[PDB]
Amino acid sequence: EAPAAVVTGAAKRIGRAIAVKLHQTGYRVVIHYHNSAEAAVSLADELNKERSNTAVVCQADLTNSNVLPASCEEIINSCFRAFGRCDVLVNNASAFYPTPLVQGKTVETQVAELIGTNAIAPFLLTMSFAQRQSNLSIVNLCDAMVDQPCMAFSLYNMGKHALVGLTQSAALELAPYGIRVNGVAPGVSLLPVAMGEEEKDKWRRKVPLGRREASAEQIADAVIFLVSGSAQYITGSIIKVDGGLSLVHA
Amino acid sequence: EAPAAVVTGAAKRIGRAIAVKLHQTGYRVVIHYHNSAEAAVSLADELNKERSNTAVVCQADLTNSNVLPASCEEIINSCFRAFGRCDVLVNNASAFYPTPLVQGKTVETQVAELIGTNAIAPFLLTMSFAQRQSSNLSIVNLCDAMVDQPCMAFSLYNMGKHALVGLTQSAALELAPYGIRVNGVAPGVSLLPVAMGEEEKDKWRRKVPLGRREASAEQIADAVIFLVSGSAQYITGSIIKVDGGLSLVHA
Amino acid sequence: MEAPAAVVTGAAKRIGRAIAVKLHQTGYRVVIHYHNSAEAAVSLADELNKERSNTAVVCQADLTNSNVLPASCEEIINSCFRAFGRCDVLVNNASAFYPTPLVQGKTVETQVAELIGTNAIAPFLLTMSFAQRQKSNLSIVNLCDAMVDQPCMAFSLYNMGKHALVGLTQSAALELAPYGIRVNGVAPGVSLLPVAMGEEEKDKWRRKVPLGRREASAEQIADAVIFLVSGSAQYITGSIIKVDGGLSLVHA
Amino acid sequence: MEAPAAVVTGAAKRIGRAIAVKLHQTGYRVVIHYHNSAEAAVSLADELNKERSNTAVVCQADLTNSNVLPASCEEIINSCFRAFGRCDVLVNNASAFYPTPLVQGKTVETQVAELIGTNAIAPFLLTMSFAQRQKSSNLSIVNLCDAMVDQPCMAFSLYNMGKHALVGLTQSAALELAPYGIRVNGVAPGVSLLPVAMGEEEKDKWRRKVPLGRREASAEQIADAVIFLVSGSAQYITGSIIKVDGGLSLVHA
């Protein structure tokens, strides 16, 4: 009776907040993770303490390779194995780091990681979700700043642009199956763990609405809306949740 | 105690559905109308039967003129008079008709209606709303998902709707320091113009990827409800398409 | 009779003059429209006529919206036919630009008439008159703004007018395509800074431009107009070319 | 050594050929990159060298993504410096295009490698190699984009993803390379040269959708926009994508 959702990169930060809010809404959840095993298992424990048998973890590397289609099929299969259905896919997992055009990872590894996590894995996950098929939908975590990108982040930005293309192409192609495909695009939300406080404050000061970053819960709220019955005519839409950041000129 | 909302063009169709759903969410509402007095009062009666003294009507022509600024100030003022506050402005009223570039309203009348109602009145209402201002204050503008693939011979209408996107962005930036969010909802085909023939209505319905049907007014209202809610408190300057995928469909 | 002819609105100075000059150098006869800048307009027409006799005229009009604006726009197009017997190109360059804050000597209705009139309604009415007068490589070029999605604070009416001009560009490209009239736009970021602006403030904006940390010259903007009216753009309609040195790509 | 030089990928046929011809007519020396079309690439180089000796060479490479793609792309740029002593212009034109339906003899990872490699990864690697070699002059890159990226063909998700990635590259590289004086722009066709084997009755279905003339763009019309973007008339233009689509993208369903 309860619907089920897969959330990628769900052990921490925004993906954790999405998994938590879906669970609070009544979903059973697959918490996908790559390296954060302890955090993933800890979240599943918390959710299961709340309602038994409503959360599982599923480990996978979402870097592009010739076995990525199998890994993505397994993530979807894990939801059917645990819960007998898969109603919602949230493509949240993402690699993010600079790749300067002018000069420990080879460039082909950087392509595989940045384009794999942000674009190819979402595509393969979408394929597997659709092939295995109420209120079915997919939500892709996009980036409100894709047209005003950070300096030296070309591969990341290429991946996020590709994810916009996937959102639109899959919304078109999956509409006759009743599957909606939409996006949520943060501006600045939870800042990278590696970033110093002074730099975090630099970015906070740029946001018109409150001079602060989005909480993870604020991003999750837009995901909840798009999967809800209140969004049943919405497909191919990307909702910015950016406090007006993308409207601010240089 | 209860927040209050102004909805322009609220007597019928999409504006009515928005007013109904805001009311159901707990708002007190000003139902603005131009020509549709009977329908406006009928809605106010229905809402007041549910919760007494929670719905008022306000007449105004939203055509651009020397008096449009005073009329817009009165709409906002009516909310403050009735309810003591104005938390939400929904710019829903619109005129829609063709204005061919190559050839009984003069062109400058068409300007005053299409650009006035669809862009200048939202601008003046936004000024009045902001001037009169914990809280969750926002404005929602009814945009058009087809603004970049416009209907043939609708240049003035399309100009007004593009101007409304500009207002949404400019006002979101300028009002963010006041905690006033400014967002849009962009329908594709929703309730077809009453004048449109049944065969032409079906032609459009058949192009929509999602179920080959128009949006109900209630689906449009659901997006408005989200944007005014606490679930959207970091969202400003965003326009949510509610179009069943229609804008994605090539020629 | 066989050199083509162009109307350039707001052509006495700055970008509009550069467009008129470059069109003239390409072989066009030109109508130099102007509002207040009579001395500068006549001085330009005299220069162009010295270079080739009877190839430049001036035409005065206020492009503020009013119930007479349609007649004024009809008259601008008529001046081109009166002088040159044809009108091949329309460049909508004239523009009012000033802040209109949402929270507090012109009335708001004057500000609406000026900012929306010059930037949007006059281009629309000129587009109507241009199209209706037609009997070649016919086109319209609208001067847009690369920063319309990242607008200056407190410029809502200006930004509304430039957004409306994008809508006109696309609507008119669609509707006039059957008549062989192409309709395109050129969108500067920062080009010639306002005459009233001090050097320090100019340098603040210059420093934001990735390509050279400098504003576009007037000639650089005119170069993109010249391309869009040329035979090298015969399949281009409904396109807006940014000429902004990357400015619109730069985040906050 | 005074004439500038350009690399054009996928230049043996169709749009890339017309770009290579127009660049040569403008005074550029050209590297004609090709993958499978050797005879046509060599025929073009010989035609161009007959017009002006030692102004055209060919360079073969597969632009599918793989472990060797970065080296291949470095080699393409290197070929221009070895032939002509300079590389002023890069045109990323080569492209794979075919449907990849989401719902059900190439594996899906081959389709990823081909559609994302040709349309996006190879342009990125070529852009890296071009810039690293440059770390009077008018250096620029032109990417062949697609005016219909937001109204895509049904069941072309991987192709559309690659073309959206190419918009991202055009913008990100324009920003990052602007300090080096390298401009980065795009030209976005709607419908241009159709497949010759496509029935005329199907070609006409697409032609009739185009507002401006109810016909597809010639390859030369697309090349004309590339020529403008590399020219001295575009020296303040970077990060711009010029649609050359006859109004097709403005037409609703």
Ligand SMILES: NC(=O)c1ccc[n+]([C@@H]2O[C@H](COP(=O)([O-])OP(=O)(O)OC[C@H]3O[C@@H](n4cnc5c(N)ncnc54)[C@H](OP(=O)(O)O)[C@@H]3O)[C@@H](O)[C@H]2O)c1
């Ligand atoms: N935070 C922001 O300000 C912001 C702004 C714009 C867009 N976004 C988007 O919003 C989403 C969530 O942002 P976030 O900051 O929460 O993300 P994040 O913490 O940077 O990354 C989310 C998770 O992605 C997973 N991931 C990384 N590489 C992976 C790989 N090779 N295989 C599988 N999983 C991998 C990691 O899982 P493990 O920890 O299990 O390894 C990581 O915890 C992302 O798509 C992001 O691009 C965020």
Ligand SMILES: NC(=O)c1ccc[n+]([C@@H]2O[C@H](COP(=O)([O-])OP(=O)(O)OC[C@H]3O[C@@H](n4cnc5c(N)ncnc54)[C@H](OP(=O)(O)O)[C@@H]3O)[C@@H](O)[C@H]2O)c1
């Ligand atoms: N229906 C769709 O499929 C669709 C598609 C795209 C966008 N939209 C947008 O969605 C919104 C609502 O659409 P709708 O179809 O419900 O609108 P609508 O029925 O065409 O008109 C809404 C109301 O606007 C008011 N109005 C018109 N001209 C006016 C004037 N000069 N002064 C004051 N009020 C005036 C009218 O109120 P009175 O009846 O009181 O005179 C009318 O009932 C509009 O902004 C529209 O552009 C709708």
Ligand SMILES: NC(=O)c1ccc[n+]([C@@H]2O[C@H](COP(=O)([O-])OP(=O)(O)OC[C@H]3O[C@@H](n4cnc5c(N)ncnc54)[C@H](OP(=O)(O)O)[C@@H]3O)[C@@H](O)[C@H]2O)c1
């Ligand atoms: N300069 C920039 O950095 C920049 C940036 C973005 C966009 N643009 C766009 O590029 C175009 C050219 O810019 P610019 O800086 O050269 O323009 P500008 O000097 O600010 O204005 C050009 C002309 O507009 C005419 N104008 C103003 N109000 C008018 C009215 N009520 N009626 C008729 N004409 C009127 C004036 O003519 P008179 O002098 O004869 O009165 C003025 O000379 C404009 O459309 C502008 O918005 C420029």
Ligand SMILES: NC(=O)c1ccc[n+]([C@@H]2O[C@H](COP(=O)([O-])OP(=O)(O)OC[C@H]3O[C@@H](n4cnc5c(N)ncnc54)[C@H](OP(=O)(O)O)[C@@H]3O)[C@@H](O)[C@H]2O)c1
């Ligand atoms: N034609 C149109 O209507 C249209 C519409 C929109 C966008 N565009 C864009 O405009 C550009 C030119 O279009 P077009 O129709 O002339 O392209 P095309 O004929 O489909 O392809 C151009 C060339 O790409 C090369 N290519 C394909 N796969 C390759 C690989 N794996 N490695 C290396 N090279 C490869 C081929 O070279 P070989 O022949 O040597 O193997 C082919 O001749 C493309 O980027 C396209 O996406 C075209």
Ligand SMILES: Nc1nc2ccc(C(=O)NC(c3ccccc3)c3ccccc3)cc2s1
């Ligand atoms: N998986 C992840 N994706 C992203 C995407 C963006 C951000 C974020 O921090 N963006 C900031 C920023 C990025 C790099 C360096 C400094 C700040 C940002 C993005 C656009 C404008 C301003 C700040 C952080 C993450 S984490």
Ligand SMILES: Nc1nc2ccc(C(=O)NC(c3ccccc3)c3ccccc3)cc2s1
């Ligand atoms: N008719 C005219 N239209 C315009 C449009 C824009 C500008 C211009 O100066 N834009 C600047 C700027 C505007 C206001 C205050 C300071 C600087 C600009 C625009 C966008 C981003 C950064 C700077 C100047 C003019 S003059």
Ligand SMILES: Nc1nc2ccc(C(=O)NC(c3ccccc3)c3ccccc3)cc2s1
């Ligand atoms: N390397 C290449 N890239 C592209 C991109 C697009 C096209 C093209 O022909 N597009 C047509 C079309 C696509 C599929 C079937 C028939 C026609 C097109 C594209 C967008 C909307 C309508 C038609 C052809 C090519 S060839």
